[PDB]
Amino acid sequence: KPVVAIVGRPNVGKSTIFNRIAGERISRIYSSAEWLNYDFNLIDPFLAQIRQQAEIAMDEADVIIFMVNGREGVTAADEEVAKILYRTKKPVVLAVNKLDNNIYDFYSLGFGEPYPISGTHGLGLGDLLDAVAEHFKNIPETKYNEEVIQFCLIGRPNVGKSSLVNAMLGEERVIVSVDTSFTYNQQEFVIVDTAGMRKKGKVYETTEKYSVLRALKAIDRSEVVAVVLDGEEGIIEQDKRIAGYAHEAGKAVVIVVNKWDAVDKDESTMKEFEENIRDHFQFLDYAPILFMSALTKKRIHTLMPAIIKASENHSLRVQTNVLNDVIMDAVAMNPTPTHNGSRLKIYYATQVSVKPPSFVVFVNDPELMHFSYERFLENRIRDAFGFEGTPIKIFARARK
């Protein structure tokens, strides 16, 4: 059922690896071999023909193996493959072939951990396939075009979720075509699981636990999550746990306060509500807070742009040289701590993934990096690049 593709410039050993992991052809496409305790299927100038084959993988596969040649190091040819493979939200696992038994900066290709393999004698193959297979559980049931931005609204019953959607969809900039499809400024969007939020009126709400769980599945399926709070009734414990789940899952978040028409708006009421939110949702300092009214339509026009902005940052891919300049600047600004007699050293940093943006800093010892300092590095990356609306992950790793 899961489909796997091997992509890379010619002469990296794709065919050799393919033939090994491929069993027989199917009633074009191949099933995985018997020697594998994993069940899946396989799919079979310079730029022109790389681009075509890469775009077949990005179109047909669920997981892509990006293969390079360990004997050569990173070629400029490999770099153009990488640049093309940035175009997909589909998981890419990096395979460094022809290492019959010294992996550095393949990281530099920006897909994180390289997996050293050998078509020769299956060395490193267990690890590669484990990494490929980990992504299987996350393969979407409902599959939309890559261009589509999927998002969801969540919040307690009668916050105004249905009302927001309708006001939003009633805008001049929108064309509407279990999920709801539409375009805004001609960009394709999907609101995940709009059936779930409109199940009231069909059905009495006897408990909230199924709705909670059903909302977590929509979050799993989304890239941006709109956490909608009730301006009138204020914040509650249920709001934090779900927002907590969204943040933990690495989703872009925007916080929406609805029913703002119904609040006794003194000059400072908004700032106070903003501060209250920051205090209760301390893990969402990246998420912007939008005040609006689904009823009077005040500031409804600000929602979509925030969702767009948050989706962009969520999938933002930084250039390495700039990233390293930013981290050096930070260490120069704020020298690294000493943890039990030894000082932390940072050598290099690269982005390893998007959605959310994740970075690996190579260090002396990941133990010596305090969480506070990791938080400090996070803030300087944000200062430099923006990243509003999305969490970022930072990992310390030992060279070697």
Ligand X SMILES: Nc1nc2c(ncn2[C@@H]2O[C@H](COP(=O)(O)OP(=O)(O)O)[C@@H](O)[C@H]2O)c(=O)[nH]1
CA dist 129 and 115 (Å) reads 10
From the list 91, 193, 187, 76, the residue with the least C-alpha distance to 132 is 91
- Tokens linked to 340: 């039990």
Query: Which amino acid is located at 283 in the chain?
Result: F
Tell whether residue 211 is a contact of ligand X (CB under 6 A). Answer: no
Site string for ligand X, 183-202 (x = CB under 6 A): --------------x-----
Tell whether residue 161 is a contact of ligand X (CB under 6 A). Answer: yes
Site string for ligand X, 79-118 (x = CB under 6 A): ------------------xx-x-----------------x
Q: Is 154 exposed, middle or buried (0-12, 13-18, 19+ CB in 10 A)?
A: buried
Is 39 annotated to bind a ligand? Reply is: no
Tell whether residue 10 is a contact of ligand X (CB under 6 A). Answer: yes
Q: Which does 339 bind (CB under 5 to 8 A by kind): ligand X, Zn ion, none?
A: Zn ion
Is 380 annotated to bind a ligand? Reply is: no
Of 154-162, 207-215, 245-253, 343-351, the window that binds ligand X (rule: CB under 6 A) is: 154-162
Q: Which does 158 bind (CB under 5 to 8 A by kind): ligand X, Zn ion, none?
A: ligand X
Q: Which does 138 bind (CB under 5 to 8 A by kind): Zn ion, ligand X, none?
A: none
Are 291 and 260 within 8 A, CB to CB? yes
Tell whether residue 15 is a contact of ligand X (CB under 6 A). Answer: yes
User: Could you say which DSSP state residue 303 is in?
Assistant: H
Q: Which does 262 bind (CB under 5 to 8 A by kind): Zn ion, ligand X, none?
A: ligand X
H or E stretch at 394: strand 393-398
Residue 16 or 334: the one with the smaller Cβ distance to ligand X is 16
Which residues contact Zn ion by CB under 5 A? 339
Size of the site for ligand X (CB under 6 A): 28
Q: Which of residues 292-311 bind ligand X (CB under 6 A)?
A: 293-295
CA dist 204 and 194 (Å) reads 17
Q: What is the smallest separation between the CB atom of 348 and ligand X, expressed in angstroms?
A: 27
Q: What is the smallest separation between the CB atom of 339 and Zn ion, expressed in angstroms?
A: 4
Tell whether residue 126 is a contact of ligand X (CB under 6 A). Answer: no
Number of helices followed by number of strands (H, E) in the chain = 12, 19
Tell whether residue 158 is a contact of ligand X (CB under 6 A). Answer: yes
Q: What is the dihedral of CA 351, 188, 252, 156, to 10 degrees?
A: -160
Q: Which does 70 bind (CB under 5 to 8 A by kind): ligand X, Zn ion, none?
A: none
Tell whether residue 258 is a contact of ligand X (CB under 6 A). Answer: yes
Q: What is the smallest separation between the CB atom of 198 and ligand X, expressed in angstroms?
A: 7
Residue 276 or 342: the one with the smaller Cβ distance to Zn ion is 342
Q: What is the smallest separation between the CB atom of 393 and Zn ion, expressed in angstroms?
A: 21
Tell whether residue 157 is a contact of ligand X (CB under 6 A). Answer: yes
CA dist 346 and 331 (Å) reads 8
CA dist 116 and 157 (Å) reads 51
Q: What is the dihedral of CA 230, 185, 216, 220, to 10 degrees?
A: -150
Sheet containing 174-176: order of strands: 174-176, 180-184, 187-191, 149-154, 224-230, 252-258, 289-291
From the list 46, 82, 56, 60, the residue with the least C-alpha distance to 2 is 60
Residue 56 or 331: the one with the smaller Cβ distance to Zn ion is 331
Q: Which residues are annotated as a binding site?
A: 8-15, 44, 97-100, 155-162, 193-197, 258-261
